[PDB]
């Protein structure tokens, strides 16, 4: 159908999002250390659950 | 097995030719041809009444064995045998079902007529089909009286009769009633007939 639309606004949203810098933080371990760190996490200590165990919830329900 | 008293004795055989149970339907059926001795001209059939009696005794033999004679449901919907399965119910344990069968009986427990027999006896499989169907969902042996064009489906031992009216159904019901009493029960010394009139298992209107 129609083929010359308006180039006038390419890059609109990215060029108008407030730039944010990454908050630095101490690096995560690499290799076995991370995978170990993962192991004790998901099923050794156990944190937040719903009967179903929830991986990435933020502010939860409360 | 069954000695020699259990043979014929043409006083029994007199009842049969008297109730007319010997007369067999014109429209035969392949599962009923052994019971046909011969066919009378002018369109008729003749039941091999020996086998009728032979099965009858076999019939009674099945009615026994089963313990509590009460929950051995004798059924009819046809009016002609209704009064008969009431008298049979009266004598033997035999819980009766006269009139409509009301679907849901053997299956479906909640109901007001949840019988759980261990044997069933039926007058006419055509008109009583709903009993026979429903039985077949719950492992329940089935006795029944069968003319020649009667559905052998889902039935077991079949007594061959006439079920076209008159005295056929009561007699075979009366006789069943007799030998269920000779065997175990309270008759013994089968050589003599019965203190009970036959013409009691019959119809009304009057």
């Amino acid at each position: 159908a129609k083929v010359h639309g308006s180039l006038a606004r390419a890059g609109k949203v990215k060029s108008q999002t407030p730039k944010v810098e990454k908050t630095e933080k101490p690096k995560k371990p690499k290799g076995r250390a991370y995978k170990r760190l993962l192991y004790t996490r998901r099923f050794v200590n156990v944190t937040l659950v719903n009967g179903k165990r929830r991986m990435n919830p933020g502010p939860s329900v409360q | 097995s069954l000695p020699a008293t259990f043979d014929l004795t043409p006083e029994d055989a007199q009842l049969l030719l008297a109730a007319n149970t010997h007369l067999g339907a014109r429209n035969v059926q392949v599962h009923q041809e052994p019971y046909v001795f011969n066919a009378r001209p002018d369109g008729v059939h003749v039941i091999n009444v020996g086998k009728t009696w032979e099965k009858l005794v076999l019939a009674a033999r099945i009615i026994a064995a089963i313990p509590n004679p009460e929950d051995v449901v004798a059924i009819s919907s046809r009016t002609f045998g209704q009064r008969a399965v009431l008298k049979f119910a009266a004598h033997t344990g035999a819980t009766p079902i006269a009139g409509r069968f009301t679907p849901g009986s053997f299956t479906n427990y909640i109901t007001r007529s949840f019988k759980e027999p261990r044997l069933v006896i039926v007058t006419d499989p055509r008109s009583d089909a709903q009993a026979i169907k429903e039985a077949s969902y719950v492992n329940i042996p089935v006795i029944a009286l069968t003319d020649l064009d009667s559905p052998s489906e889902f039935v077991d031992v079949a007594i061959p009769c006439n079920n076209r009216g008159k005295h056929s159904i009561g007699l075979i019901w009366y006789l069943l009633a007799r030998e269920v009493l000779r065997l175990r029960g309270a008759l013994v010394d089968r050589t003599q007939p019965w203190s009970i009139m036959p013409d009691l298992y019959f119809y009304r209107d009057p």
Partner: protein, 217 residues
């Protein structure tokens, strides 16, 4: 407190029947879900799907959920239950019952050497529930349940250690898949192997043995 209303049910609350296959031997229509409730507790349950369906009423629309549940242990006994109803909770419940009122006997066996504890099936069996036709094949030890995650978990409760599967048909309608993966393992008791060629004398049916303690008042 359970109260039985069927002959079968009285005998089992009694103690007069100790095992389940007693009923399967005599083709006894289990009606009260309490029976298998008691003839085999520890029986594990898994819900598999809760999918919605619809309908139009003499006005607008109609909507409700549909629960599909398997019940079983892992020692030859499994059932399938599907029941759709107004709520998710009531759906699950109502169906578990339905699965248990239909648990089936499984004939496990050997693939080759009979070297201690059956691992796979007697023979090949194959079910069908319209289009979708599931067929199970014996498998050497250590093999595993090779099937859809759905049928895996269903044979898991069925108690199969190794088996191969061959799904044909629209396996995406999950319902008719399981049912025929059910129809399959239940068929196993119907394949006349020569082991069973040898005749037994036919038992007596506890409905006539305990016929006294069997009837009502």
């Amino acid at each position: 407190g359970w109260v039985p209303v069927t002959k079968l049910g009285r005998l089992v609350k009694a103690g007069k029947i100790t095992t389940i296959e007693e009923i399967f031997l005599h083709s006894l229509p289990v009606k009260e879900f309490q029976i298998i409730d008691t003839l085999l507790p520890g029986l594990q349950d898994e819900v598999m799907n809760i999918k919605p369906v619809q309908k139009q009423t003499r006005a607008g629309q109609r909507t409700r959920f549909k629960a599909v549940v398997v019940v079983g242990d892992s020692n030859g006994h499994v059932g399938l239950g599907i029941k759709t109803a107004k709520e998710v909770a009531g759906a699950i419940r109502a169906g578990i019952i339905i699965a248990k009122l239909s648990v089936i006997p499984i004939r496990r066996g050997y693939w080759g050497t009979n070297l201690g504890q059956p691992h796979s099936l007697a023979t090949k069996t194959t079910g069908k529930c319209g289009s979708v036709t599931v067929r199970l094949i014996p498998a050497p030890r250590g093999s595993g349940i090779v099937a859809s995650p759905a049928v895996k978990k269903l044979l898991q409760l069925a108690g199969v250690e190794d088996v191969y599967t061959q799904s044909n048909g629209k396996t995406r309608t999950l319902e008719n898949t399981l049912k025929a993966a059910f129809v399959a393992i239940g068929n196993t008791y119907g394949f006349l192997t020569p082991n069973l060629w040898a005749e037994q004398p036919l038992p007596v049916s506890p409905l006539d043995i305990y016929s006294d303690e069997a009837s009502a008042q």
